[PDB]
């Protein structure tokens, strides 16, 4: 009400708005325009978003983490409520570690969906009051992935138009 | 800043499964409206009144959430109320394919509004208003999928 502090610390729910903060994790290796899109989106809804980018993924990746974080910080410095960092634990633990309540996920396709449910389940579980929230890809970046553009780009196909400048020169470079 | 939420559906009647969501939605946005669609496609068991009137009383307990009828372009509606984000449920595979359809064309209509999904708890996952009225139009307990006033009004309007 006013200097209720005396009473009541205050819950989550029931209540009116509380303050957000979003983590949206992933290997991004590298950033591409659907990611900084996606994140574009949630940090104009969101108080703060943190990208949190995976140390050591399951496949070895072709930037390391400190080459990812560089480019994802460049890429995003535009946006004054979001941090890139790394992390090296369950998505579930880091937004813990963080005191993150919003748990940011791309939704690209219909395979993906049921992986997603599922996903969701299990963070329910781990972190109660972690909330999942789902974004569609804009149409201009429906079909691309990191992968994709990589595999494009190893074989000389023009990818200017699914990068930003500083990650589309870094990946020229790791390509010889 | 302000933040403005849409949740639109036909809630024939709203269940646990919406409240639960709109709950979620009232958590995270600093207003949100319940927006209930006039004249849907399929005549609804409950009319726009009797819709609104239940879903008003069934969220009265959120102090940043209006219920109200609807009967026009999503866009315009939004445009009107000054909301900058739309929130759906997302149950099934089959709901997906067609909710990613219309915020394609709701980008085209309104770029400025922003569709965000959000998926059912565990608990409600199966739930829909049309299969708690097929059940309780054969006699089925349905008491833990409504709320108490929605529950009441669905009894009635099988006697």
Known sequence: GSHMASMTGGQQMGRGSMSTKAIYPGTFDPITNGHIDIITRAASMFDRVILAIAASPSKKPMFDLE?????ATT?????????????????A????????????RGLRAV??????MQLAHMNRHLMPELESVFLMPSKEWSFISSSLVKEVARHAGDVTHFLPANVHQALMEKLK
Do not use: K, T
């Not at 890429?75 to 998505?91: C, I, K, T, W, Y």
């Not at 633990?93 to 940011?104: D, K, S, T, V």
């Open 93 to 104: 633990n880091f937004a813990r570690a963080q005191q993150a309540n919003i748990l940011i």
């Open 67 to 71: 080459e990812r974080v560089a480019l």
């Open 111 to 116: 395979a993906d969906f049921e992986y997603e």
């Open 75 to 91: 890429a995003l410095q535009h946006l004054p409520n979001v941090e890139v960092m790394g992390f090296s634990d369950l998505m």
